[PDB]
Amino acid sequence: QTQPRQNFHVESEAGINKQINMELYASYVYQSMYMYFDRDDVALPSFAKYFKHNSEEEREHAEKLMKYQNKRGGRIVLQDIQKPDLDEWGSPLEAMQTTLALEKSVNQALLDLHKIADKHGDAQMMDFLEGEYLKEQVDAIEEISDHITNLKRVGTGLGEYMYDKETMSS
Amino acid sequence: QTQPRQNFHVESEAGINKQINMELYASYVYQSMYMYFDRDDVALPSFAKYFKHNSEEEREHAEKLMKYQNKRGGRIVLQDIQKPDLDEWGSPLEAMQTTLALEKSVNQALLDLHKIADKHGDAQMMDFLEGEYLKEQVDAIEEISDHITNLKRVGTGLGEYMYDKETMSS
Amino acid sequence: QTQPRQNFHVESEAGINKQINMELYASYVYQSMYMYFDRDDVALPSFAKYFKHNSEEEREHAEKLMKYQNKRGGRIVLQDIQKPDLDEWGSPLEAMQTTLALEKSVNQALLDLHKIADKHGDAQMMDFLEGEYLKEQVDAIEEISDHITNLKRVGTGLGEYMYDKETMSS
Amino acid sequence: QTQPRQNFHVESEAGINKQINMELYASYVYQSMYMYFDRDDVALPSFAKYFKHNSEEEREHAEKLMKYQNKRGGRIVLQDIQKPDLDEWGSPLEAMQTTLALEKSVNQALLDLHKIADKHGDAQMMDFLEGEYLKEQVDAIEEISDHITNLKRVGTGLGEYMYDKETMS
Ligand SMILES: [Fe+3]
Ligand SMILES: [Fe+3]
Ligand SMILES: [Fe+3]
Ligand SMILES: [Fe+3]
Ligand SMILES: [Fe+3]
Ligand code: NA
Ligand code: NA
Ligand code: NA
Ligand code: NA
């Protein structure tokens, strides 16, 4: 074994490599959304920055898992990062609905990864996932659900513009 | 020859004089738009200030070319500054559409002036135009295209008022 | 055409989409190198941080080209980001030699993209590439060449450790 | 029962007393290594301070478990602190290899104690161990593994001296 390795199962190691790819994929989706809201014919700059930020955050999520792989003595194996499903993402509301489903997909994958750690009695991996990943996911799903509700409330047009200036602005 | 003159073709010198007049003309158009949005029956003061600033910037564009003419040893020859095409400029959206076409006209003239410097191997004139003029034009066309898209999004009425207060305000 | 489009050829637009993918690929290679030097059996943390920062820089190179695509009125079309050629990168010296070849591949691709802008008389795109990309590549190729020379000078073992603590550390 | 006691099994209480002794033992081993690198014929003063600090940290680990025992209503029962297996610890590389084994033994003992808490549904004790012990052990095993790799890279002699001045300081 690698010299750090203790109580670290090959199934957990492989699950981490899968999750790494999924976090990189989500980063790529949010990068595409960022540049979609940066188009001259969309032009919602705070929506763009919001997805810019979330793209960067997902990349950090991926790198923290890579670091955790190394820390426990696993070996990172990278795969292609698939291009996003779409090239353009519709209305602000539609884009938020898309990211809710993405965040729920990542959340279920993290919960499935947590189950692997649990099967193999990997108490430290479970605590790492709960604190660094599962808490963030429930917060993200809360934030996106709020975005969807408000965008439905304000409607299309002036409402989308004002949401960019008020809520999406930092 | 004038004492600075080196690698500076009479066609480039004449092209600069033509471009100086065009920049002064663009300044005059934005001055008209400034005072149009300052009318009691239009009364959108941040739109007004935006065209005021753009009028001022175009005048400095013209003056920087005058300075460059002198720097290379050419001789400035001024012409009448034609009055703008209209006396009034319609809606905020219509005024922004007018401005996009103006900036595209100025941009093509600068590219045509760049082509003259290029024909005559005026490497320094090309670098001056790219850095001090072509980059600004690409940025201005971007900025105005965004204005048009947002004004179409927010619509007339409250939308124009909020666009004045949010985006157009400094 | 899109609103901003002027003097912007479809061949240049397509070339930018290709270059965006190449920059994202180089980011992925440096991310792999980052985590490789973060392995417990390599454990050169300033080499790791060096490749982490180069990965971040290459990702910003990609995003700047995405922004330029939008600014000129092109449409970003993303493709899969291919996984790096190797999972492990050898000695510090070997990884740097790999890095030199990658930056030369990127540099030739950028020169090839510059030539497309040149064919189509895209004066602004040429100036953008020169200032924001070509200068960086000459600097990076210089920096990696120096690293290779110094790593050959210090040799393996203590030399690699001291290079990590002196030159690679900030 | 003691007045705070609730959801606290006698097997967990006994396991805490065993783990307290092991943390005190680990502190004693690192104290011996500290003073070994302080010998006039070893004289690597930053290695010495590294093991000095880890000896203090292990003693803090023991006292945190003592406080936890009291907090939950258990009773601390102390045992002899056995002397370390050796009186002298060899090269920096050998001392680090010994330390990796020691930290792995402590980690397994903490995982076994976490298992006892889990058996008896002691949710609070598991969370305490996870946050205050298990995360620290994976960090420590990471740090020592890096030390071993670098000591193998730099070799004996000048390399050990430079490692003392750079990484260990
Ligand atoms: Fe994530
Ligand atoms: Fe101008
Ligand atoms: Fe690059
Ligand atoms: Fe301990
Ligand atoms: Fe927990
Ligand atoms: Na944009
Ligand atoms: Na007025
Ligand atoms: Na590491
Ligand atoms: Na001493």
Residue numbers in the entry:
A (entry chain C), B (entry chain F), C (entry chain J): 3 to 172
D (entry chain B): 3 to 171
Quote the study that presented this structure, word for word.
Ferritin represents a ubiquitous class of nanocage-like proteins that are primarily involved in maintaining iron homeostasis. Accordingly, ferritin plays a central role in taking up iron (as Fe2+) and storing it in a stable and unreactive form (as Fe3+-oxide/hydroxide). The crystal structure revealed that TgFer presented a typically 4–3–2 symmetry in a cage-like, spherical shell composed of 24 identical subunits, featuring highly conserved organization in both the ferroxidase center and the 3-fold channel. Each of TgFer subunits is characterized by a four-α-helix bundle containing two antiparallel helix pairs (A, B and C, D) and a fifth short E-helix that forms an angle of approx. 60° with respect to the four-helical bundle.
In this study, the crystal structure of TgFer was solved by molecular replacement and contained a dodecamer in the asymmetric unit. The final model was refined at a resolution of 1.78 Å and featured a visible electron density for residues 3–171 of each subunit, resulting in an Rwork of 0.20 and an Rfree of 0.23. The resulting TgFer structures reveal that only one Fe2+ ion (Fe-1) is bound to the ferroxidase site with occupancy of 80%, where it is coordinated with the OE1 of Glu25 (helix A), the OE1 of Glu60 (helix B), the ND1 of His63 (helix B) and two waters. In the crystal structures of TgFer and TgFer + Fe, only site A of the ferroxidase center was occupied by Fe-1, but no clear electron density indicative of a metal ligand was visible around site B, similar to the structural features of Marsupenaeus japonicus ferritin (MjFer). In TgFer, the hydrophilic channel penetrating along the 3-fold symmetry channel is considered to represent one potential Fe2+ ion entry channel to the ferritin cavity. One Fe2+ ion (Fe-2) with an occupancy of 60% is coordinated by the three OEs of Glu132 residues (distance of 2.63 ± 0.08 Å) from all three symmetrical subunits and three water molecules (Fe-2–Wat1 2.91 ± 0.11 Å, Fe-2–Wat2 2.73 ± 0.13 Å, and Fe-2–Wat3 2.83 ± 0.12 Å distances). Electrostatic potential calculations showed that the outer entrance to the 3-fold channel is conspicuously surrounded by negative potential values across the whole region, which extend across the protein shell to the inner entry. Major contributors to the conspicuously negative potential over nearly the entire 3-fold channel include the highly conserved residues Asp129 and Glu132. The prevalence of negatively charged regions is significantly dominant in the inner entrance of the 4-fold channel.
